[model samples]
Target chain A: AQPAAIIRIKNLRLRTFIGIKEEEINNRQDIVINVTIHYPADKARTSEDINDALNYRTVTKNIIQHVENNRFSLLEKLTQDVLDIAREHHWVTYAEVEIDKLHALRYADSVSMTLSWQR
Target chain B: AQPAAIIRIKNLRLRTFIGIKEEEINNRQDIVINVTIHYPADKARTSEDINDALNYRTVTKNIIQHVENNRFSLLEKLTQDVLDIAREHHWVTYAEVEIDKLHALRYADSVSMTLSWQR
Candidate 1:
């Protein structure tokens, strides 16, 4: 049983109305989130118990709800809230999250923010 | 002079030949990296010296060159390496790195990895 193991959810695609402008605020745009969760894996690994494991499905669903339910003008603040959600798990030692707003800036691939939280 | 500061680089787009496929190896696809660095701001904030700053331009350039010079089979490792580079700066106490492989997966906006390191 290792003290810590990394669990990641990558390329979580969703469409939500976000941003500071009228059009962007009215239109549902594509956003992607990538998250890595670090927690104790010893119990889960040894018992092969679902209870001991970090339930990523709940974590992701909560993230979707949080993002979809709220409106944010700034990516920084939004990312911080998302990080808080990921770190809600009792076992989580650290969590890193990134959110990408596709085509937010002209001639730019995307606008994104990365935030980390440590317990 | 604040005890801690957050420095971020958002949406660093670079075209590089990356992937495990033969064709992907031949073509340069767009990859973007976003990073956040945490460090002591007391010295830089007081001295008003560029030398006391974290020199994000140099850090960003080094990341660009590293990605261009190497081919990675996994985004996680590449992100770790990039995180390492960010933490190389003497001032940095914590660093988080995320890489997005644009169009890597069909019907998916992107494939990405997020990693964090702390001293």
Candidate 2:
């Protein structure tokens, strides 16, 4: 048995909205997000087939579509949206999420948080 | 009604372990992770303070440190780690995580999954 290596994307950029108040309804600012996930290699590794494993391109594409198409009432509900996707997929085992607002920091340049999950 | 924005991270990198079988456990692969999270802006916006808002820098820094610092027996456990962080944090509303294995493919490239969670 050989140890495997899972690929990683460092510092991805995305913009979205979050709000549940009167003033917050006024404008839409860009928000940044970061993520990570892990899975096993038996099927794809042994079968040597694309269908046998996770497709990263599809994953990112799905995120863009999922976020761009939907609007939510709360941030808590929004975060759950992504978690739901991960849980649905059979291969996904773990993930982490971080979100940021470009000008959110009054004195600094940015504001962000790092969060992760595993199946 | 202000349409608030929740910053999104396009992609982030992290290496973790995931497996279900003896062969799979033999290897601690380098897993790539991507994520997205959204939340309301009323609290952070009106207060005009860091505590009232989402912290992107802290999020990302936490991600880097979190990834570098932790080890899990399962991918599911690892993903839960981040989800727990979000659930525990009062500011976070929604979060999505994607994990990728870089060298997963024998012919083309990688394998990955993107998942989301709402609070």
Candidate 3:
């Protein structure tokens, strides 16, 4: 069996209204999103055709749209929303999404949650 | 049993001399790094003291120093090296590291590798 090709969208920096705090509710905060999708690339690897490959650009664009346009009080919901977007393509066999809320904790760099989906 | 507290250092953007192509070898390219460390936080949760918590700032500083100061030919090696730093704390129960090499592939957003360690 051919190994699955992994496509990663990394360090997608976006601002959103997240968390339940009063300031959080009114202010936009920075959230860093990372997504990974796995799918068989047996055809795309050799064919060199755009149709054969999973179009990550479109996936990324969709994610950006959804994230920027939505508001949430929970990171879990946001992460799952992005995971759903990553798995929208029928060719994807596995998908994982992690969203980091910067400076969520006073001393920590960030607080994050990860969710995954697989066929 | 108390749950482990997860600490994440997200979207650490750094430039490094990576890859094997002529341009890659000569030019420094952007690499995004994400790290997660899990450890028991029962003490830190209530203590409100620096000594009780894992020092993510130190870990991140170490990672920045290593990635910027060194050269690597493969993503795997670079990822492993960073993983080692994440697991340096004896209290850490699990650690995961992923490094993304931006624009490594023509169509994909980035090429990345993930490595993890568990106690």
Model 1 per-residue lDDT tens digits across residues B1-119: 45788889999998877656888777878888899988876655753566556788899899989988887654545666787798998788878877777766543466565667667
TM-scores of all candidate predictions against the true structure = 0.53, 0.44, 0.52
- Residue pairs in candidate 1 whose N, alpha carbon or C atoms collide under 3 angstroms: none
- How do the candidates rank by TM-score, highest first? 1, 3, 2
When 1 and 3 are scored with lDDT, the better candidate is 3
Tens-digit lDDT string for candidate 2 (B11-99): 55555556666655666677765556666644533323354455554666666667657656666666666655544446667777766
Q: Write the per-residue lDDT of candidate 1 for residues A63-87, one digit (tens) a residue.
A: 8888878778778888888899999
User: What RMSD, rounded to one decimal, does every model reach?
Assistant: 10.3, 16.6, 11.7
B38-100 per-residue lDDT for model 3 (tens digits): 876443343233455466667887888898898899999999999999999878899999888
**Predictions in order: lDDT:** 0.76, 0.56, 0.80
| DockQ of model 1 vs. true complex | 0.08
- Give the Å error, residue A12, model 3: 19
Quote the positional error of residue B22 for candidate 2 in Å: 65
Worst ten in a row by lDDT for model 2 chain A: A105-114
Off by over 4 Å in 1: A1-119, B50-52
lDDT of 2: 0.56
